[PDB]
Amino acid sequence: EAPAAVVTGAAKRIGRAIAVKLHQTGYRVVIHYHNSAEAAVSLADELNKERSNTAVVCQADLTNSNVLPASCEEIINSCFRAFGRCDVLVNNASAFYPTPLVKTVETQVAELIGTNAIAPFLLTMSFAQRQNLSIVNLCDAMVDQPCMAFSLYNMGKHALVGLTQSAALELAPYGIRVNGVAPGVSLLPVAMGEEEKDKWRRKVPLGRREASAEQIADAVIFLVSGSAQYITGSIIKVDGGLSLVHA
Amino acid sequence: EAPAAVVTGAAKRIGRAIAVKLHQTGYRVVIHYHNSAEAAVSLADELNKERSNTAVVCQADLTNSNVLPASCEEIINSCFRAFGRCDVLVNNASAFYPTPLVKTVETQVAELIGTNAIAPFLLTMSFAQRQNLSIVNLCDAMVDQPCMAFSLYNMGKHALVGLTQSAALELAPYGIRVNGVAPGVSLLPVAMGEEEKDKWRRKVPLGRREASAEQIADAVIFLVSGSAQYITGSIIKVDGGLSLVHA
Amino acid sequence: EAPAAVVTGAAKRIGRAIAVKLHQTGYRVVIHYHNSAEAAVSLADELNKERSNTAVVCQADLTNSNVLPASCEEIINSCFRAFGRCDVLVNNASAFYPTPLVKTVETQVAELIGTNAIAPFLLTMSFAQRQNLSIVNLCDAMVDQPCMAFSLYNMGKHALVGLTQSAALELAPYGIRVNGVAPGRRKVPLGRREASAEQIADAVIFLVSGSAQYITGSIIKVDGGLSLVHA
Amino acid sequence: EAPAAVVTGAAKRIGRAIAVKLHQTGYRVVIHYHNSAEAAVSLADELNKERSNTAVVCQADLTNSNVLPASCEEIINSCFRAFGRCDVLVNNASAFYPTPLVKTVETQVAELIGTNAIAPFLLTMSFAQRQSNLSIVNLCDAMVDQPCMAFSLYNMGKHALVGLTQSAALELAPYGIRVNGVAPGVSLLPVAMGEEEKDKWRRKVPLGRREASAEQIADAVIFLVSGSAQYITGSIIKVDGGLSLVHA
Ligand SMILES: NC(=O)c1ccc[n+]([C@@H]2O[C@H](COP(=O)([O-])OP(=O)(O)OC[C@H]3O[C@@H](n4cnc5c(N)ncnc54)[C@H](OP(=O)(O)O)[C@@H]3O)[C@@H](O)[C@H]2O)c1
Ligand SMILES: NC(=O)c1ccc[n+]([C@@H]2O[C@H](COP(=O)([O-])OP(=O)(O)OC[C@H]3O[C@@H](n4cnc5c(N)ncnc54)[C@H](OP(=O)(O)O)[C@@H]3O)[C@@H](O)[C@H]2O)c1
Ligand SMILES: NC(=O)c1ccc[n+]([C@@H]2O[C@H](COP(=O)([O-])OP(=O)(O)OC[C@H]3O[C@@H](n4cnc5c(N)ncnc54)[C@H](OP(=O)(O)O)[C@@H]3O)[C@@H](O)[C@H]2O)c1
Numbered sequence: 001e002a003p004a005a006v007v008t009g010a011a012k013r014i015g016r017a018i019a020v021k022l023h024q025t026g027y028r029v030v031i032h033y034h035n036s037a038e039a040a041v042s043l044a045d046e047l048n049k050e051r052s053n054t055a056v057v058c059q060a061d062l063t064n065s066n067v068l069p070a071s072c073e074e075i076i077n078s079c080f081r082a083f084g085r086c087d088v089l090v091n092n093a094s095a096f097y098p099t100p101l102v103k104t105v106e107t108q109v110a111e112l113i114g115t116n117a118i119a120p121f122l123l124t125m126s127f128a129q130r131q132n133l134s135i136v137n138l139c140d141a142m143v144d145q146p147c148m149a150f151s152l153y154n155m156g157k158h159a160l161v162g163l164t165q166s167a168a169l170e171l172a173p174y175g176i177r178v179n180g181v182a183p184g185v186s187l188l189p190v191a192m193g194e195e196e197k198d199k200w201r202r203k204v205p206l207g208r209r210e211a212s213a214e215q216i217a218d219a220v221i222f223l224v225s226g227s228a229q230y231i232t233g234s235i236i237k238v239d240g241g242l243s244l245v246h247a
Numbered sequence: 248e249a250p251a252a253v254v255t256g257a258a259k260r261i262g263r264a265i266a267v268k269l270h271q272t273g274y275r276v277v278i279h280y281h282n283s284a285e286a287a288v289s290l291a292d293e294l295n296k297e298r299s300n301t302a303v304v305c306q307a308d309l310t311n312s313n314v315l316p317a318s319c320e321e322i323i324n325s326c327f328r329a330f331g332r333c334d335v336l337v338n339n340a341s342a343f344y345p346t347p348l349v350k351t352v353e354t355q356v357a358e359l360i361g362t363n364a365i366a367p368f369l370l371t372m373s374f375a376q377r378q379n380l381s382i383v384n385l386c387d388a389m390v391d392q393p394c395m396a397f398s399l400y401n402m403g404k405h406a407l408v409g410l411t412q413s414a415a416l417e418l419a420p421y422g423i424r425v426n427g428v429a430p431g432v433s434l435l436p437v438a439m440g441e442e443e444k445d446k447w448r449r450k451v452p453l454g455r456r457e458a459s460a461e462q463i464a465d466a467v468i469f470l471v472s473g474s475a476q477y478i479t480g481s482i483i484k485v486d487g488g489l490s491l492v493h494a
Numbered sequence: 495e496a497p498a499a500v501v502t503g504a505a506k507r508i509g510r511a512i513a514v515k516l517h518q519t520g521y522r523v524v525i526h527y528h529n530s531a532e533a534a535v536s537l538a539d540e541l542n543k544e545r546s547n548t549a550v551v552c553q554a555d556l557t558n559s560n561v562l563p564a565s566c567e568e569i570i571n572s573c574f575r576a577f578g579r580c581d582v583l584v585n586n587a588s589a590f591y592p593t594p595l596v597k598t599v600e601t602q603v604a605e606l607i608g609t610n611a612i613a614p615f616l617l618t619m620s621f622a623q624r625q626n627l628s629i630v631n632l633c634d635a636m637v638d639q640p641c642m643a644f645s646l647y648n649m650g651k652h653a654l655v656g657l658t659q660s661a662a663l664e665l666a667p668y669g670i671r672v673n674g675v676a677p678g679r680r681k682v683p684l685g686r687r688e689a690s691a692e693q694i695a696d697a698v699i700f701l702v703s704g705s706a707q708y709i710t711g712s713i714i715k716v717d718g719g720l721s722l723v724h725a
Numbered sequence: 726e727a728p729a730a731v732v733t734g735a736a737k738r739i740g741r742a743i744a745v746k747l748h749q750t751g752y753r754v755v756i757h758y759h760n761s762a763e764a765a766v767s768l769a770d771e772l773n774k775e776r777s778n779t780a781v782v783c784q785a786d787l788t789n790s791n792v793l794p795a796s797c798e799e800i801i802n803s804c805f806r807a808f809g810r811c812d813v814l815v816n817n818a819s820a821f822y823p824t825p826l827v828k829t830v831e832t833q834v835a836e837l838i839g840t841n842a843i844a845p846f847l848l849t850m851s852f853a854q855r856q857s858n859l860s861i862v863n864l865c866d867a868m869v870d871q872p873c874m875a876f877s878l879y880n881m882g883k884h885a886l887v888g889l890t891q892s893a894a895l896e897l898a899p900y901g902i903r904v905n906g907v908a909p910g911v912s913l914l915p916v917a918m919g920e921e922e923k924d925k926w927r928r929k930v931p932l933g934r935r936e937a938s939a940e941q942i943a944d945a946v947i948f949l950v951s952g953s954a955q956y957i958t959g960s961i962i963k964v965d966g967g968l969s970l971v972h973a
C-alpha cells in the first residue's frame with residue numbers, strides 16, 4: 001500500500017508545503033494543527049480531492065505539560081487509525097517569539113521548549129514504539145548565530161539538534177533514520193512589514209531572497225527518499241549561504 | 248571588597264572543587280545544593296574556618312516546575328543578602344541518567360531539561376536583572392557524539408550550549424561574559440566498577456585517565472579571571488582529546 | 495540542450511559512480527584521470543554506447559606544482575571544447591595515506607594538499623572564470639575525528655571545507671552553488687545496509703538538481719551515522 | 726632551569742605580545758622573524774636587558790618550498806642551541822591577503838598555505854622529533870566558518886590549521902605534548918588600514934565594540950601553556966568578544 005506520514009504544524013506555510021509534496025510523492029498524510037482548523041481542513045479536502053482517503057487532520061497543542069506524552073502518542077495513533085502504518089514523521093510545528101533575559105516565563109518555557117524539542121522527542125518515542133522509516137526535524141541554520149533576545153527559542157532548536165543526533169544513533173538498529181532540514185530565511189511572518197522583510201532578504205548571498213516553502217520541502221523529500229538510505233544524523237542547511245556570512 | 252560567586256550543585260565532586268578554587272582565589276561563595284545538605288554544610292564550615300563569613304549554603308530543587316523561577320531568583324538573592332554583590336554564576340548542577348526512546352517521562356523531562364538548561368536560563372535572567380561579571384556553564388565535550396539512550400540529557404546539554412551563546416550575545420552590552428567548560432571523562436561514579444571506569448579512562452588520549460575535579464575547576468578560574476576579559480561565548484573543552492577520537 | 499559535468503578521479507570507485515549517475519540523469523561528462531587511462535576510456539565507451547558523444551576523457555596529474563594551474567584550466571576547457579558548456583564540477587579526486595608526525599615530506603604535501611585542496615581551488619577558479627551551475631566537493635565525514643597519523647590528509651580535507659564555504663559565499667552572486675558530500679561496519683549505526691559508491695552519488699545528484707536550488711555552503715554527511723559514534 | 730619557547734612571527738603585534746608574556750612568565754624565548762629584523766632585535770634587546778641570555782632571534786621564510794622542512798627543523802634547533810631545551814612552540818606567523826576566485830597563484834598558495842598550515846605542521850614534526858609541560862599553541866581564526874569575502878586561500882590555510890591542531894593533539898598525546906589553539910576575531914587591525922575601516926570592524930564586536938588587545942590574545946596562549954591547562958589538548962579557545970556569534 002501507500003506509505004503514510006505525520007507532519008506537525010501542517011496547515012500553513014512550510015508544514016503545508018511539506019505535506020503537499022509528500023502527498024504528491026505518494027504518501028497518505030496526517031495534517032497536524034493547533035489553532036488553524038479551517039486551513040487544515042481545507043488542505044485535507046484539497047488532497048482528498050486528488051486521491052480519496054489519503055489525508056486526515058489531527059488537532060493537538062504541543063506545549064509541554066503532563067499530558068503532552070498522551071497528545072503525542074495520539075498523533076501517531078491517528079496515523080495508524082487512518083492508514084494502518086506510519087512511515088515518516090516530520091517535526092515542523094514551532095513556537096517562535098523573543099524572551100529577553102533583562103505569558104509567564106514558565107509558559108514561555110513550556111511553549112518554546114515544548115514545541116521545538118519536547119514534542120519532537122515524545123513524537124519520536126511514540127513513532128518508534130508503534131512500529132523506509134524516517135524522521136525529519138525542522139531545525140534552524142542560524143542556531144549558532146542566534147537572534148538577539150531569542151534565548152528560549154534558540155535553546156529549543158539546539159535541543160532539537162541533540163535529539164536528531166541521539167535518535168539517529170539509538171533508532172538506527174530499528175531501521176529508522178533521523179535527519180534535519182535547517183532553513184535560514186524562509187517564509188517571513190505575515191505580520192512583518194515589507195521594509196523589515198527586505199532587510200532579511202538582503203542578507204542572503206544566493207539571490208537576496210528567502211527560501212520558498214517548496215524549497216524547504218524539497219530537502220525533506222530527499223531525506224525521506226530511497227536516495228538517502230545511508231544518511232542518518234545529518235542536518236541539511238537550506239539557507240542560501242546565510243550562515244556563512246559574518247557580522 | 249571581595250567578589251562573590253554562586254555555584255550550583257556545589258556540595259560534591261566538580262562543583263565542590265569549583266567552589267573551593269573560587270574561594271582560594273578570593274571569592275565569597277554561595278554553595279547551592281539539593282539533597283546533599285551535610286556535605287554542603289561541611290564545605291561551608293571548612294571555608295568559613297579558612298576565612299570567616301565567606302561561605303553560605305542555599306538549598307533548592309532545580310527540576311523544572313511552576314516554582315523554579317522563584318527558586319532561581321532566591322538563589323541569586325541569597326548571594327546579595329550574604330555578600331552585597333554577585334559577580335560570578337557557575338551553572339554546574341546536573342541530573343544525568345538514561346531515557347531510552349524504546350519516574351514518568353515528564354518527570355524526566357523536568358529533571359534533565361530543568362537542571363541542565365532551564366535552571367541555568369532562569370539563574371542567568373536573575374543574575375543579569377540584579378546587576379568583571381561572568382557566567383560559566385558546565386557543558387559536555389561529547390555533546391555531538393552522545394551516549395546511547397541519553398537523549399533527554401543530551402538535549403539538555405545542547406540547550407545549554409544555545410543558552411551560553413545567546414546569553415553571551417545579549418548580555419555583552421551589560422559587560423557580562425558568558426562561557427562554558429566542557430568536561431569529557433571527569434569524575435566517574437564511586438559505585439562504577441573499576442573495570443568499567445578503566446574502559447572510559449583508556450579512551451582518553453592524554454594520559455588514559457579522567458580529569459580531576461580540580462582540572463575542570465582550573466578552566467572555570469581562567470574564564471572568570473581578568474585573563475579572559477575579551478572571551479565570551481566560548482566553550483573550553485577540558486577532555487584530554489577524548490572528543491577527537493573516532494569510533 | 496544537455497548540461498555538462500566534470501568529475502575528477504572518475505575512472506573508479508566513487509568518481510565512477512558519480513559520473514555514471516550524472517550521465518543517467520542526462521549530463522554529458524568529462525571523465526578525468528591521472529594513471530587510470532584504460533578504466534577511464536572503458537567508462538567513456540560504456541556511456542557513449544548509451545548516448546553517442548556524451549562522454550570524453552581528460553588526463554591530468556593533480557599533484558601541486560608549477561603546472562597545476564594550467565592542468566586545471568585544461569580540465570575545465572576540455573568540457574567547454576567537447577560540450578560547449580560546463581554546468582557542474584565534482585571535485586572527487588583524492589590522495590590518501592598516512593604521514594606520521596614522529597616520498598619526501600614535501601612530495602606528500604604536494605600530493606595530499608595539492609590533490610585534496612589546491613586542485614579543487616584551481617578548478618573552482620577556472621570553472622567560475624569561464625562562466626543551474628554548481629560545484630560539489632567530496633569531503634570527509636570524520637574531518638573532526640581524524641585517523642591517527644593522517645595529519646596532512648586531514649589538513650587537506652579541512653582546507654576543502656574552507657574552500658567549500660569560501661567559494662559558496664564568493665560565487666553566490668554568479669549563481670554558482672558550492673556544496674559538499676562527506677562519505678564516512680559493525681560500528682556504523684546503519685551497518686545493516688552496505689555502504690556503496692551509489693549512495694554517495696545519490697547525494698551529489700540531489701545537490702546538483704533543481705531540488706537543491708537554494709542550497710549552498712552545505713556539506714551532507716553520507717556515513718550511516720558513523721560520525722555520531724563516540725570512542 | 727627555565728623553560729624555553731619558540732614564537733613564530735614574534736617581532737611585532739600579537740607574536741611580540743606572546744613572546745613578552747612568555748618571557749614575563751619565566752620562559753627563555755626564540756623570536757622568529759622573516760623581514761622585521763630591526764623590530765626582532767629591538768625586542769630581544771629589551772628582554773635580555775630584563776634577564777641576560779633569555780632571548781635570541783631566528784630568521785626564516787615560512788613560505789612553502791622544498792627547503793621549508795629544513796628551515797623549520799632549524800628554528801627548533803635554534804631553541805636547543807640557545808637554551809638546551811624547547812618546551813613550547815607558538816605558531817603565530819601568518820601571511821594574509823585576498824585571493825579572489827574571479828604574485829603568481831602558486832606563490833600565493835606557497836605563502837598562504839605555507840605560513841598558516843605547512844610550516845606549523847613541519848615545526849610540529851621537528852618539535853616532537855627533537856624531544857615536564859610540553860605544548861604547542863596554534864594561532865587560529867574565530868571567523869574560520871564565516872570567512873571574509875575573496876580570502877579563500879587564507880581561509881583554507883586556517884582550516885588546515887584547525888585540522889593540524891586536532892590531528893597533532895591526538896597523535897602527540899602519548900608523548901605528553903598538548904596541542905591547542907587560540908582563535909582571535911578582531912584583534913590588532915593592519916597598520917595600513919584607515920581608521921574608518923578599523924571602526925567598521927570594531928563596531929561589530931558585542932563585548933565592548935573594540936578589538937582584542939595583543940595582550941588579551943597572549944593571555945589565552947599563556948593559559949594554554951600553563952599547568953592550569955594540563956588536561957586540555959585539541960581545544961581551540963575563541964578570543965573574540967562574541968563576534969563569531971553575530972549573524973549577518
Ligand atoms: N520561516 C523561517 O524563515 C524559518 C527559519 C528557520 C527555521 N524555520 C523552522 O521551520 C519550521 C517551519 O517554519 P514556519 O515559519 O512555517 O513555522 P510557523 O508558521 O511559525 O509555525 C508552524 C506551525 O507551528 C504550529 N504551532 C505553533 N505553536 C504550537 C503549539 N503550541 N502546539 C502545536 N502546534 C503549534 C502552528 O500551528 P497552527 O497554525 O495550527 O496553530 C503553526 O502554523 C519551524 O520548525 C521553524 O522553526 C523556519
Ligand atoms: N563527571 C563527568 O565526567 C562529567 C562529564 C561531562 C560533563 N560533566 C558536567 O560537569 C558538571 C559536574 O559534573 P559532576 O559529575 O560533578 O555532577 P554530578 O555529581 O552528577 O551532579 C552535581 C550535583 O548536581 C545536583 N543536582 C542533581 N539534580 C539536581 C536537582 N534536581 N536540583 C538541584 N541540583 C541537582 C546534585 O546536588 P545534591 O548532591 O546536593 O543533590 C549533585 O551533587 C555537570 O554539569 C556535568 O554534566 C561532568
Ligand atoms: N572511500 C571512502 O570511504 C571515503 C571516505 C571519506 C572520504 N572519501 C572521499 O570521497 C572521494 C572519493 O573516494 P574514493 O575512495 O573513490 O577515492 P580513491 O579511489 O582513493 O581515489 C579516487 C581517484 O583520485 C585520483 N587521484 C589520486 N591521486 C591523484 C593525483 N595526484 N592526481 C590526479 N588524480 C589523483 C585517482 O585517479 P587515477 O586512478 O585516474 O589515477 C583515483 O582513482 C575522495 O575525495 C575521498 O577523499 C572517501
Ligand SMILES: NC(=O)c1ccc[n+]([C@@H]2O[C@H](COP(=O)([O-])OP(=O)(O)OC[C@H]3O[C@@H](n4cnc5c(N)ncnc54)[C@H](OP(=O)(O)O)[C@@H]3O)[C@@H](O)[C@H]2O)c1
Nearest residue numbers: 734738739758759760761786787788817818819864912913
Ligand atoms: N590581527 C587579527 O585581528 C587577527 C585575527 C584573526 C587571526 N589572527 C591570527 O593571529 C596571528 C597573529 O596576527 P597578527 O595580526 O599579529 O599577524 P601579522 O602581523 O599579520 O603577521 C605576523 C607575522 O607573520 C610573519 N610572516 C608573514 N609572512 C611570513 C613568511 N612568509 N615567513 C615567515 N613569517 C611570515 C611576519 O613576520 P615579519 O614581520 O618578520 O616579516 C609578521 O610579522 C596570526 O596567525 C593571525 O592569522 C589575527
Ligand SMILES: CCN(Cc1cnc2nc(N)nc(N)c2n1)c1ccc(C(=O)N2CCC(C(=O)OC)CC2)cc1
Nearest residue numbers: 093094095096097098140147184185186187188189200
Ligand atoms: C529570518 C527568520 N525569521 C523568519 C521566521 C518566521 N517564522 C518562523 N517561525 C518559526 N516557528 N521559527 C522560525 N525560526 C521562524 N522564522 C524571523 C527572524 C526574526 C523575527 C523577529 O524579529 N521577530 C520579533 C517579534 C516577533 C514576535 O512574535 O514578538 C512577540 C517574533 C519574531 C521574525 C522572523
Ligand SMILES: CCN(Cc1cnc2nc(N)nc(N)c2n1)c1ccc(C(=O)N2CCC(C(=O)OC)CC2)cc1
Nearest residue numbers: 340341342343344345387394431432433434435436447
Ligand atoms: C564518562 C562520563 N561519565 C561520568 C559522569 C559522571 N557523573 C556525571 N554527572 C553529570 N551530571 N553529568 C555527566 N556527564 C556525568 N558524567 C559517565 C558515563 C556513563 C555512565 C553510565 O554508564 N550511567 C549508566 C547508569 C548510571 C546510573 O546508575 O545512574 C546514576 C547512569 C550513568 C556514568 C558516568
Ligand SMILES: CCN(Cc1cnc2nc(N)nc(N)c2n1)c1ccc(C(=O)N2CCC(C(=O)OC)CC2)cc1
Nearest residue numbers: 818819820821822823866873910911912913914915926
Ligand atoms: C578582522 C580581522 N582583520 C584584522 C587582521 C589583521 N592582520 C591579520 N594578519 C594575519 N596574519 N591574519 C589575520 N587574520 C589578520 N587579521 C582584517 C580583516 C580584513 C582585512 C581586509 O579587508 N584586508 C583587505 C586589504 C588587505 C590587502 O589587500 O593586503 C594586501 C588584506 C586585508 C584586514 C584585516
